[PDB]
Amino acid sequence: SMRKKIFKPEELRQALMPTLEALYRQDPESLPFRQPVDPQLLGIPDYFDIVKNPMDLSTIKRKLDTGQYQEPWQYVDDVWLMFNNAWLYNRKTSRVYKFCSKLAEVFEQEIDPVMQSLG
């Protein structure tokens, strides 16, 4: 039977970096997401009462550039984890919530065709 494809880091990078660059270019919308959450500096000391698995753009980038991803779905799941964290922690009337809803719309649009074309 057909086995699960493991990818060359170089192919994963060359196929998925663009969808990540599309998020990063949105400014200010990507600013909330660029850097691991510091609950002290951001003045949100209850952050980890609500979020339990942190994730950010800088973490996804390093994972991609040091080939820690073997399958493209691991990348996709990490992006959605970062967005689901934001939707869960922040109010619907907040900028981080609204920035999240907007970077999600961009991502769905970049990523859905890329995944058609990968094994």
Ligand SMILES: COc1ccc2c(c1)N(CCC/C=C/c1cccc3c1N[C@H](C)CC(=O)N3)CCC2
């Ligand atoms: C307390 O905010 C600050 C203070 C100084 C400056 C801030 C924000 N901006 C944006 C930084 C990114 C915000 C990050 C952020 C700030 C408040 C709440 C959330 C944030 N995001 C991550 C995703 C955590 C989250 O869910 N909700 C840069 C200029 C200096």
